[PDB]
């Protein structure tokens, strides 16, 4: 599969077809790791992400910081 490195704003970047991105389980706005070895630039998904528990978040909810449900309105 042939692509290219081009200038996107201030940075070099490489285009990938949506079908390939989709075939590799990546999405727009995903973080990736690019560890380089030998002569092939390497790019992979991140495995580590922030983790929270139900208890830690719910216990920090208070009557004072609770938000009402957003009124989305109608079209």
């Amino acid at each position: 599969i042939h692509s290219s490195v081009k200038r996107w704003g201030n940075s070099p970047a490489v285009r990938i077809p949506a079908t390939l991105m989709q075939a590799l389980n990546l999405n727009i706005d995903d973080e990736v790791k690019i560890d380089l070895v030998d002569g092939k630039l390497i790019i992979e998904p991140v495995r580590k992400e922030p983790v929270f528990t139900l208890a830690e978040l719910v216990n920090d909810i208070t009557p004072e910081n609770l938000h009402e449900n957003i009124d989305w309105g109608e079209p």
Partner: protein
């Protein structure tokens, strides 16, 4: 005709009569494009330190996404506009907090 279709991570203005609510898109382009719907979470400048709040940096206004208020919206019928995108780390925090509730 050229029309905006949202991507995961886009910050959009969702319209309603009158008139708009800022939101962060959670679902992918393919689903959004095919259905005219998208999952998102609303934003507000009213930060209170609520645990499901995720701070969004480098935006026009200071604000937070309310991660627990996941909403399926008919973005195509309503007529959404792109305002920017959130950082990968911010989207991960939103998704990690949602996971606690429906993961």
């Amino acid at each position: 005709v050229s029309r905006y279709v949202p991507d995961m991570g886009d910050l959009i203005w969702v319209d309603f009569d009158p008139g708009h609510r800022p939101a962060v898109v959670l679902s992918p382009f393919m689903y959004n494009n095919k259905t005219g719907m998208c999952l998102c979470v609303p934003c507000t400048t009213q930060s209170k330190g609520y645990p499901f709040e995720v701070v969004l940096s480098g935006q026009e206004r200071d604000g937070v996404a309310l991660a627990d208020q996941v909403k399926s919206i008919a973005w195509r019928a309503r007529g959404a506009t792109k305002k920017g995108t959130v950082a990968p780390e911010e989207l991960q925090l939103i998704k990690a907090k949602i996971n606690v509730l429906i993961g």
